[PDB]
Structure 1
Amino acid sequence: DLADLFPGFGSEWINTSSGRIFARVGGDGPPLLLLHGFPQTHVMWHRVAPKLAERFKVIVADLPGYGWSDMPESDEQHTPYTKRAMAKQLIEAMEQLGHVHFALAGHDRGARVSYRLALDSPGRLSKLAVLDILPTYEYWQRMNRAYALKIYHWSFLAQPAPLPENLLGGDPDFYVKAMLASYTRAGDLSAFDPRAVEHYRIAFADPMRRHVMCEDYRAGAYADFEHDKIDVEAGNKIPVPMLALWGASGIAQSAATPLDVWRKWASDVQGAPIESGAFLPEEAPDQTAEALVRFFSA
């Protein structure tokens, strides 16, 4: 019922102690993990993954609780869907494949999993790439009226259950599509493959998957923030050589000077703006792929 946007890629259901992680696996060479964000799945990499496959062994994984990944039971602190736990679970997953030192690239929620992984376990990463994000700490500290209105859903979805859930039940199709079109450059869905939008909408049409997304944004308003406050108070920087890509019309640039912020969180960081909205790998696939290939190859 859902299209194949990764021709040639296999399908792996990697076992962890918190549940199965689904991923499309293609190419050969150095291991490169790709992590998606909200409200998308692994298929958001379908326009750049084949190019990366020509050079690397590309693992395109659904986040814990997302897509076809299992949904581990959450708790009163939203632990399994905190960026620290997600990182632990994916580290565990990559160990099942023999990948204990790999390249990592993330977008939105996946980028947050990524930099948290780098802080907690720098050893697991050769190079890091974060796409159109700032540290979760940075958004909350810089929170103003402009901030609050634009990215309203950081506060909205972090509301205690079942208030966001019950509201999302009203028109999940509309909401998930609105979340996609609102952060592009054109303001519509033209950037997204209609088949890819189907993957997103189908997953979002399930109440259980939506609950996970809320538990995600709850973690991002509490545990993730507290985890980030500890680091920023200690003065810990990410030692992993990392790349920061953001859309010129993206979310991160309206907030701050992206590479100036990431220089405060990482000692070895380079970055560039790309003519795009928030959804870089779909809006500007050629440039995004090129940036990643050249960076991970160096």
Structure 2
Amino acid sequence: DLFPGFGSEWINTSSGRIFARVGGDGPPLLLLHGFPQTHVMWHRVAPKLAERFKVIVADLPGYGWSDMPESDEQHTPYTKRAMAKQLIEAMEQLGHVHFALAGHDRGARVSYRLALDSPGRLSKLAVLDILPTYEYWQRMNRAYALKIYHWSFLAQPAPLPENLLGGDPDFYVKAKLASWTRAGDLSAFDPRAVEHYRIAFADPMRRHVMCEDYRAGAYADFEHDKIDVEAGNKIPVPMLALWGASAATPLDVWRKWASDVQGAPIESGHFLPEEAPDQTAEALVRFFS
């Protein structure tokens, strides 16, 4: 238990339960993790946020201890549009129809898709260390193909990645965690947190969900994004983009997708809330207050 003073809830939805740690009081704030992690990646910043907010730390649909909806040929329940609908249902179970939202990695993709589809749900939005899925794929030249190979590899038709990942999943997940930190090793993480990530990744069913998520990320999610950029749609919700310091700035890019956005680099690799918990917490608290 990495969340002192937080409850544990499975929240019912039409697509399956969402697991969350729930703590604090005040305005509601939902925190969404990404790959290859779970809700526990927020354990270092959740307490400072809970000083001021009611904090709901949720496992994404099919991740962690959340239920795994059956997928289909277009990967629908693991599209960011579907994940956002499911988390909107979960927040309604708690009586939250207007809330603050911060996401990281895949959870940040859920979050900006939520803001594009249903802006009235959000008071404020923070996205951590991402650009829109459309922008990634538009940037996908030799240098990007090499640097972020896993967007194409994990999106290969089943069972190719599932088969490869089964041989030594501990090694793959630990290498991903290490490779995207400033330090290049696991020293930025709490070993208890790494064990949560390892345990989740050890399950073949959980890994299949992850591949479905990246398949959606290459196909429907991209198409959904393309419709908005073609329509000139921008997020109206007050928005914060944080990114790890370790091409146009991320702020230059999000200003093209959002009409009220501020942003800043954090001295950190990808995993801002774990590598740079103090700076990340401070920036979020200032933003959401």
Output the TM-score relative to the length of structure 1.
0.96
Following TM superposition, by how much is the alpha carbon of 1:171 offset from its aligned partner in structure 2, in angstroms?
A: 0.7
Structure 2, unmatched stretches of 5+, are none
1:240-287 deviations in whole A, cap 9, x for unaligned? 000000000xxxxx8641000000000000000000000000000000
Q: C-alpha separation between the residues in 2 aligned to 1:69 and 1:122? A: 25
CA distance in 2, matches of 1:255, 1:158: 25
Q: 1:156 maps to what in 2?
A: 153
The 8 Å contact of residues 147 and 255 in structure 1, kept in 2 or not, is answered as: no
Quote the RMSD (CA, aligned, Å): 0.7
Question: Aligned pairs, how many?
Answer: 289
1:35-184 aligned within 5 A: 35-184=32-181
Instruction: Output aligned runs, 1:177-256, within 5 Å.
Output: 177-248=174-245, 256=248
Once residues 229 and 131 of structure 1 are traced to their aligned partners in structure 2, the CA distance between those partners, rounded to angstroms, is 21
Cα distance in 1 for residues equivalent to 2:143 and 2:197: 27
Deviations 1:107-152 (A, max 9, x none): 0000000000000000000000000000000000011111111111
The match for 2:15 is 18
Q: SS at 1:72's partner residue?
A: coil
Secondary structure of 1:69's counterpart equals coil
What runs of 5+ residues in structure 1 fail to find an aligned partner?
Answer: 249-253
Contact 1:134 1:258 (8 Å CA) reproduced: yes
Deviations 1:207-236 (A, max 9, x none): 000000000000000000000000000000
Q: Cα gap change, 1:69/1:255 in structure 2, threshold over 3 Å: closer, same or farther?
A: farther
Contact 1:94 1:100 in 2 (8 A): yes
1:294 to partner: Cα distance: 0.4
Residues 105 and 128, structure 1, Cα contact 8 Å, conserved in 2: yes
SS at 1:286 equivalent = helix
The CA distance in 1 between the partners of 2:175 and 2:31, in whole Å, is 24
Percent identity between matched residues is 99
By how many angstroms is 1:8 displaced? 1.1
Kept in 2: contact 1:36–1:106 (CA 8 A): yes
Return the alpha-carbon distance in structure 1 between the equivalents of residues 142 and 22 of structure 2.
Answer: 42
Q: Secondary structure at the residue paired with 2:135?
A: helix
Q: SS of the residue aligned with 1:130?
A: strand
Moved over 3 A (4+): none
- Aligned-partner SS, 2:218: coil
